[PDB]
Amino acid sequence: GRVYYINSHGTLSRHENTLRFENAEVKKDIPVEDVEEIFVFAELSLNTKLLNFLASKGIPLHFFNYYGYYTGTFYPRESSVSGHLLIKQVEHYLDAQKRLYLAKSFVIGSILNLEYVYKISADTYLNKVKETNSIPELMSVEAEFRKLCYKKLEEVTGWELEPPQNPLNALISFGNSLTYAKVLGEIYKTQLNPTVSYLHEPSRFSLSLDVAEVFKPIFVDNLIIRLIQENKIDKTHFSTELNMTFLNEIGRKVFLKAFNELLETTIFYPKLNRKVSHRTLIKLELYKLIKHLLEEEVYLPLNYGGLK
Amino acid sequence: RVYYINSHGTLSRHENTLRFENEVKKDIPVEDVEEIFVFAELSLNTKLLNFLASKGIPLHFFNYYGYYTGTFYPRESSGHLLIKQVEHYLDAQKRLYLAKSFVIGSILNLEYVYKISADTYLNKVKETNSIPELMSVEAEFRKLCYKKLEEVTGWELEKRTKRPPQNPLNALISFGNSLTYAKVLGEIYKTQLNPTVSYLHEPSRFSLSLDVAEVFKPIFVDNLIIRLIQENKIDKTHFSTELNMTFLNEIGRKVFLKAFNELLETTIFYPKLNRKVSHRTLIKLELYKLIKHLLEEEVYLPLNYGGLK
Amino acid sequence: RVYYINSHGTLSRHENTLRFENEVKKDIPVEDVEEIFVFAELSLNTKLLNFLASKGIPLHFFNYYGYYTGTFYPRESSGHLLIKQVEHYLDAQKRLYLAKSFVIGSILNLEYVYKISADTYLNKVKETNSIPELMSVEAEFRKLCYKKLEEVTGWELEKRTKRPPQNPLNALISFGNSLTYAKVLGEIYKTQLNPTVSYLHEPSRFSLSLDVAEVFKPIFVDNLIIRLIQENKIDKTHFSTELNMTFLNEIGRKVFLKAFNELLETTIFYPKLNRKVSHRTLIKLELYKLIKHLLEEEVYLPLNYGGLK
Amino acid sequence: GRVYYINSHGTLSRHENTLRFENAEVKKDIPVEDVEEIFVFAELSLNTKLLNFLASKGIPLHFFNYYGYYTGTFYPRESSVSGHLLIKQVEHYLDAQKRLYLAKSFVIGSILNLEYVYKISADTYLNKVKETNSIPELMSVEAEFRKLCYKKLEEVTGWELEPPQNPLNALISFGNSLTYAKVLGEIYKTQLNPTVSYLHEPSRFSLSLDVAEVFKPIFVDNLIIRLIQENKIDKTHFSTELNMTFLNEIGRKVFLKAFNELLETTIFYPKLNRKVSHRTLIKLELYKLIKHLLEEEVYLPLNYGGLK
């Protein structure tokens, strides 16, 4: 378990070249070598001695408040920088034709994966994408198919779908933020700059937003459907306080355990003739993008259905 | 607009503002803060971070010596500059203009330091049509300066050597250059400019610090070296030679480091501001000029140190 | 085939051969010489040069310490390699193969030094499809090694820092790396390979020395550092820290330099040659492998130091 | 006079950060700062202290023997290197289409300048160049026009033209070598590698051979015609010894003075709205090539006639 999740209130610190979490009930040492990223969901006291240490090991920290609302990320000083790649990233944005191809690829990845999850024909939508030259249009089309899938999510779950006013909306927002953060963490480990995107305007980490479009159906929608239909997540995993409905502590733990188990679940990847983790699919997707920006190979979005 | 934290302590949310404690307890109106830079050891918690996120205020962390460790980026911070930076690189014409500007600044300031007429070389710079050609002209003027450096000091230079420096002068130049690149990079990190995008030097780590330093090296390195040697503050006993390698010793580094820092802290009248600013601030002001240039606001003109006397 | 001049003296034409004098007077059959490398102070004249030109023999000049100064090139010397070098760079597939080879050599030798199983990472290297991806894997294994370096020495590392080194270990790594790049470059200049063309590192000064050094750094730097620290030859008194900068002092440099040179002079049995060669010669042998690779003769395989024990 | 010519037997050495030439009759100090290149035509004693000094100032040394025969050059360690440019130089050679364009441009530059000097129509030859795709053919065509011009050189001078067996052949060889050397010296000052060419095979400094093709008509043919017709060079400036005819000492000095005065003669250069030296035309030609290799501007060979 390379990703570390903190669900208890306490103090996180650097202790003898390792991490230490402590509160009134516990004091555990966590070898910083087995930690690649940290998600924080509780009240935590920390200091620069800790942050400078995490920065040194290249460990991003993601924060979520009482309501499970993602508030921000401690993004460490970059480990590896590539001026060439950076130029190419921006070049593919400045050139309308290059940017269009990428903007479309991300939308296609999103539609294809939503189609796999919701089993709704996307041919009509994919056709519009193939025929337009307007990025704003692509967005419009993607939002149209996304809307269709939300209407179906509501039917397949039986939960009402509309700041989350409903348990389902809470689940969607929580899963989406977890995905945005996880993707951001993967971008950090590469030479890619997280602010240069092609679908979404470059602001906010726009590249994470673009890439997450391809993965959200897998880490969010699909997981939510299974958790609700298999009765893993139910109405007792949510709370409504001051007209604020949110995934609570117990529910948050159920979802995170499911999210992390999915991240670590392996799947056969033809190109490597071996099974890779879902987390690795994100990494591999980033390297496919990099190779595209380097003009070495055309970028094709992950067609998750094809691996199943 | 920007809040700098230079002392160790604790930062937290108190009521609806920020509070710093350590001896001293100070409330800081958050309504004014756009960004917070931390240059000291700090204790904080999620209550503080979530509060900053709610206000859209990023929190930049640096260790005591200025080494950047990372930034807490709010979900929604209240990348245009980056695009503009690369834009002026991709457009060969825009790139060449900036590359020439840094060289012109280097030449103008070497002129002030060495007192070698730059009139003809500045015109030659204007005439070049590519970066390679531009560099050849810079190398020519640079050669005239190193020759004079040998004459005004009486020390051997012969040729610029860096791997490794073959004599005291090259050892001093390398040390001074390093201190200058670091100082400039430090100022860059205090702005929104990405340090990886340069125009004179090839971007392919922090190339922008190299470009901007061209304008300041004559003042922080050449000029200082000449002063220290002629005033007998740096002499032959401040160096150690191993085989073909010459190194500035401990005592030597301290002497130079101290003078460098004192120079950076020295103030000088800045007309446009109608007040005296330190030499470090001149770097910031130079970066501000580059930004306004990249933003299509006002054309970048290199610092003509001599104009400030 | 190649004649090396390592002692000071006079080189001239005598009858129809070469003659070196200084104490000693030696005639050198020119019929055997293809190239002449000079590593000492030499006196000569045009009669000698015209004679070498007539035979088509180039005369390469280096100062006593190995610094290349220039070459007397005959009108007709009796650039194919250069074309082949760039050819393997332009072909992304050929470049990637070479970049992976140097990384594999680095990993194999770090494995021998740190005793950390490289099996999985070597397979990951094989799977990468681009230089950026390849570098990420190298960085991963490198991280495991620096962690162990801290454990087997008890000294702080925390992270690789170079501008400037923030602690003794980084100061030693930077010094050792520098000595290694120089040593490798020196061997490159003794071959016909252009030092500017690399595959792992971006060509855009002497990038090839950087690539090839990846294979030797674990042996000449990491391994030596560990040995010197564990045997108490290099300790805390061999360093000086200024603010955030840590430097290896005079005594420290001498100790390390001496050990480095002694290591390079150490011999080890080389199976394919069925004899013992120095560690410096292993570099030359590695360059020979690269050349035969670039000439489409035999595929380049990095040096697996452990295989030599 | 940045170029230095040594026509007396002696010793050249470094003396107090300057150069010193000495023999039995003289001892002069030459500030190394005013020296950019040195051509040697007499017996000279030298050492590494001198060569390492010249290398430091980036001063190439060209050697010529008793017969005025160019024997070689001391090419110093490069002052400025550019890995990018080097890649681009070889790239334009490896790619048949890129190499063809350059191979043709050099031949065109040669034919156009020979045409200006000899006043012989080259349309027929230029047409063949424009229609072929064979570099060997280009050479064949260039050699054909070159042959025509030699036949005319013989008529316009009245000197017989054929190791130089005739005074005219001696002049041509001497001037050609001086040009090859001078061009090599200009290449040294740039980031260009002298061994990568497009017309001539990359060996020998093939790039100097290519570029010299464009300039030889100006520094050799044209100068020879004027020197002979104006009676500056005559039969007493040559010697025949052991069936070896060569430009002798007095003649060598007449030619070198003429060659150097031409190098320093200025000519109006529209693009700069000012007059530049002929030596600068060589430099400018190299930068035109560099800009072409960098994919910034198409390379067009110097049309000397156009500046007159």
Swiss-Prot record, chains B, C:
Entry EC number(s): 3.1.-.-
- Read off the HAMAP family from this record: Cas1 (MF_01470)
Q: Which UniProt keywords apply?
A: Antiviral defense, DNA-binding, Endonuclease, Hydrolase, Magnesium, Manganese, Metal-binding, Nuclease
Kindly list the cofactors needed.
Mg(2+); Mn(2+)
The upper taxonomy is: Bacteria, Pseudomonadati, Aquificota, Aquificia, Aquificales
Kindly state the subunit structure of this protein.
Homodimer, forms a heterotetramer with a Cas2 homodimer.
| Chain residues that bind Mn(2+) | 138, 201, 214
Protein name as it appears in the record:
CRISPR-associated endonuclease Cas1
Q: Write out the similarity annotation.
A: Belongs to the CRISPR-associated endonuclease Cas1 family.
Q: Name one Pfam family in it.
A: Cas_Cas1
Q: Enumerate the Gene Ontology biological process terms.
A: defense response to virus; maintenance of CRISPR repeat elements
Q: What does this protein do?
A: CRISPR (clustered regularly interspaced short palindromic repeat), is an adaptive immune system that provides protection against mobile genetic elements (viruses, transposable elements and conjugative plasmids). CRISPR clusters contain spacers, sequences complementary to antecedent mobile elements, and target invading nucleic acids. CRISPR clusters are transcribed and processed into CRISPR RNA (crRNA). Acts as a dsDNA endonuclease. Involved in the integration of spacer DNA into the CRISPR cassette.
Per its UniProt entry, which superkingdom is the organism in?
A: Bacteria
UniProt GO molecular function: DNA binding; DNA endonuclease activity; metal ion binding
Q: Does the keyword Hydrolase apply?
A: yes
Q: InterPro entries from the entry?
A: CRISPR-assoc_Cas1 (IPR002729), CRISPR-assoc_Cas1_C (IPR042206), CRISPR-assoc_Cas1_HMARI/TNEAP (IPR019858), CRISPR-assoc_Cas1_N (IPR042211)
Instruction: Look up and give the organism this protein is from.
Output: Aquifex aeolicus (strain VF5)
